[PDB]
Amino acid sequence: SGFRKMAFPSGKVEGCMVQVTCGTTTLNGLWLDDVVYCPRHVICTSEDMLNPNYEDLLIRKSNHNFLVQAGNVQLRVIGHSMQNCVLKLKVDTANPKTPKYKFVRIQPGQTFSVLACYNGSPSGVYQCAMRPNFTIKGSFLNGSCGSVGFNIDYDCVSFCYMHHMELPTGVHAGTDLEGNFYGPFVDRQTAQAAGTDTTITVNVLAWLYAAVINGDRWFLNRFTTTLNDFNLVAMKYNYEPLTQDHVDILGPLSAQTGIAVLDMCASLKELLQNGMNGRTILGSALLEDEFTPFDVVRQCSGVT
Amino acid sequence: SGFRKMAFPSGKVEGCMVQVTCGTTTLNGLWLDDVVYCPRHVICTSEDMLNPNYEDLLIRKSNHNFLVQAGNVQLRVIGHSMQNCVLKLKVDTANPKTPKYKFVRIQPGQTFSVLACYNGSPSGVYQCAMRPNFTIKGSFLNGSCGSVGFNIDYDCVSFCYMHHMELPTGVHAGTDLEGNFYGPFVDRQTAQAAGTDTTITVNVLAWLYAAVINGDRWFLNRFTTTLNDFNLVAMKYNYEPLTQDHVDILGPLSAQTGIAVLDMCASLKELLQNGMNGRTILGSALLEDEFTPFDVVRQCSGVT
Numbered sequence: 221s222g223f224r225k226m227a228f229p230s231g232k233v234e235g236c237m238v239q240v241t242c243g244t245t246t247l248n249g250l251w252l253d254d255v256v257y258c259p260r261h262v263i264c265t266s267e268d269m270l271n272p273n274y275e276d277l278l279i280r281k282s283n284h285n286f287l288v289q290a291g292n293v294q295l296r297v298i299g300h301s302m303q304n305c306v307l308k309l310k311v312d313t314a315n316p317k318t319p320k321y322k323f324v325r326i327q328p329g330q331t332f333s334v335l336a337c338y339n340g341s342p343s344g345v346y347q348c349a350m351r352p353n354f355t356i357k358g359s360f361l362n363g364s365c366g367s368v369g370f371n372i373d374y375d376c377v378s379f380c381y382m383h384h385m386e387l388p389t390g391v392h393a394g395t396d397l398e399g400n401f402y403g404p405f406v407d408r409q410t411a412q413a414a415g416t417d418t419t420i421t422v423n424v425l426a427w428l429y430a431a432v433i434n435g436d437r438w439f440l441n442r443f444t445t446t447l448n449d450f451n452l453v454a455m456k457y458n459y460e461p462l463t464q465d466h467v468d469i470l471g472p473l474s475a476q477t478g479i480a481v482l483d484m485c486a487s488l489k490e491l492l493q494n495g496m497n498g499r500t501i502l503g504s505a506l507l508e509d510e511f512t513p514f515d516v517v518r519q520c521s522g523v524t
Numbered sequence: 525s526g527f528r529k530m531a532f533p534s535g536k537v538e539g540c541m542v543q544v545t546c547g548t549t550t551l552n553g554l555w556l557d558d559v560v561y562c563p564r565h566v567i568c569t570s571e572d573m574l575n576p577n578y579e580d581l582l583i584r585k586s587n588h589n590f591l592v593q594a595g596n597v598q599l600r601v602i603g604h605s606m607q608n609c610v611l612k613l614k615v616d617t618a619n620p621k622t623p624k625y626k627f628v629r630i631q632p633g634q635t636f637s638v639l640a641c642y643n644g645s646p647s648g649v650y651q652c653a654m655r656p657n658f659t660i661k662g663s664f665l666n667g668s669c670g671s672v673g674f675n676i677d678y679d680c681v682s683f684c685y686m687h688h689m690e691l692p693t694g695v696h697a698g699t700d701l702e703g704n705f706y707g708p709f710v711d712r713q714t715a716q717a718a719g720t721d722t723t724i725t726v727n728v729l730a731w732l733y734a735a736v737i738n739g740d741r742w743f744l745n746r747f748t749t750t751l752n753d754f755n756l757v758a759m760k761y762n763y764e765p766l767t768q769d770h771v772d773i774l775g776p777l778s779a780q781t782g783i784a785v786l787d788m789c790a791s792l793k794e795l796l797q798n799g800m801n802g803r804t805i806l807g808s809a810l811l812e813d814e815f816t817p818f819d820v821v822r823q824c825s826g827v828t
């Protein structure tokens with residue numbers, strides 16, 4: 221019993237974290253097979269970052285300008301290419317610690333673990349979601365760029381995020397591992413505001429299901445609702461609209477707890493309209509939206 | 525910027541997690557050098573757990589009754605001893621992945637990362653504190669025992685906790701790695717209630733310092749207080765009394781933010797007496813007490 225905000229073990233990803241230096245700039249890189257992936261702004265000064273032309277800046281760079289250090293041993297760079305907003309550095313040695321891995325572009329609402337790294341040395345690990353405004357609420361200082369987001373399916377590391385920007389509001393933007401940014405963000409120090417940070421309605425329902433299971437049941441009510449009725453309340457409270465797809469995904473938890481998805485929606489509705497009244501659900505004073513249905517099932521069944 | 529509940533990388537500890545089977549019982553073990561550490565209740569059925577005499581139960585066991593599996597390779601057991609509430613299984617092979625390590629008995633209020641394991645396979649990792657009632661608020665199912673708590677100082681893993689019991693209230697009890705339980709708990713399925721779960725006042729102040737730094741400042745006030753005055757409020761609200769030692773420890777954060785420890789105490793006092801008024805500090809609707817002063821400094825300076 222007990223429900224915690226829980227990250228995948230980072231061991232498999234600690235073994236891929238290297239230091240990438242280009243001139244004065246030193247951020248983190250991901251060494252998989254004979255390729256090291258890092259943010260392309262490694263080639264930039266903080267002065268370049270106001271309006272960089274990466275194609276032009278890159279012409280001036282050579283294989284030998286990119287210094288890749290894995291622990292206290294340097295890797296020889298035998299090729300470099302720009303894909304979108306990441307560089308791919310081909311090294312002469314394949315990473316002996318390369319796990320099974322895929323690159324996956326995640327959807328908003330999806331969760332992943334982040335290994336925070338400075339100088340290719342991991343500092344800590346926490347769990348995150350891709351917000352519906354394509355930001356993430358991270359913890360990232362200077363030198364934390366090229367830190368990666370991942371999920372783990374038994375032995376296979378699916379990489380979903382590489383860290384790039386901190387918006388003036390202190391929320392975080394970044395790319396998949398094909399270097400395509402999540403949302404309309406660009407590796408440029410410009411006016412970049414995030415849209416409405418809406419609550420991930422399905423994840424809140426999952427997390428309510430997790431509470432019931434883990435003993436916290438005060439918030440169960442006699443009422444039910446419809447999708448259309450519940451959504452009018454969701455809209456008002458800047459909650460993501462709930463679809464039949466979201467309901468289907470909550471079926472397992474529905475079945476396990478024998479509480480209908482729409483009964484639990486009616487529970488949430490009342491929590492939105494009436495608040496918590498100074499009470500707590502799973503040691504939290506607000507409605508947590510960074511646990512997927514899949515995250516609850518996993519933690520409540522104990523998958524390794 | 526941004527402040528997250530952050531665990532140490534678990535890589536160094538993933539490499540010490542093995543499966544320990546004795547008869548039908550299979551929990552997790554910690555393989556360091558040529559010794560595998562596990563909870564002594566591995567020798568028990570769930571029927572033994574009502575009133576076990578471990579000395580007597582252990583006489584019936586031999587080196588060959590203890591089956592230790594590291595991945596898909598079995599380790600040969602050449603000796604076994606009981607220390608307090610843990611078994612130490614001497615194996616013929618030393619763990620090639622043994623990091624630098626110490627065993628440390630932590631104090632209440634101190635934080636540590638937990639790698640949750642089932643069948644010696646890590647499932648996830650989260651950050652915890654030793655509560656002032658010598659419980660921890662974990663996430664642990666059946667087979668999660670012998671999961672370990674640790675801190676990491678650069679390369680040295682200090683192990684502070686091995687998981688043993690879930691109290692009828694769904695909070696968790698366990699030992700240091702010398703097998704001595706935190707608090708008055710015993711590896712016996714008996715009436716065991718936790719005492720008053722008080723709030724770790726120093727950690728709340730640290731976490732308030734973390735907020736100020738990270739942009740959240742609404743809760744700063746014009747008022748200051750004394751230690752004796754603040755403590756009368758702490759007592760009322762079941763908060764741990766603040767000492768000159770706690771103040772001294774908050775000096776670095778005091779100095780960095782140029783907010784006096786007693787000014788910040790006056791800030792907290794008002795939050796206790798007036799609540800948050802539907803507002804949030806670092807994305808949390810209540811006062812978080814599972815970040816040490818040291819945890820804030822580390823995350824706000826980016827130690828690896």
Ligand SMILES: *CC(=O)N(c1ccccc1)[C@H]1C=CS(=O)(=O)C1
Nearest residue numbers: 245246247261262362363364365
């Ligand atoms: C993204 C990041 O953390 N860094 C950065 C800053 C400007 C341009 C590229 C990368 C830091 C990486 C190391 S640093 O101290 O040079 C700045």
Ligand SMILES: *CC(=O)N(c1ccccc1)[C@H]1C=CS(=O)(=O)C1
Nearest residue numbers: 549550551565566666667668669
């Ligand atoms: C502590 C724990 O998780 N387990 C346990 C239960 C009873 C006695 C000793 C250990 C589980 C370990 C594997 S299990 O399924 O046999 C029970």
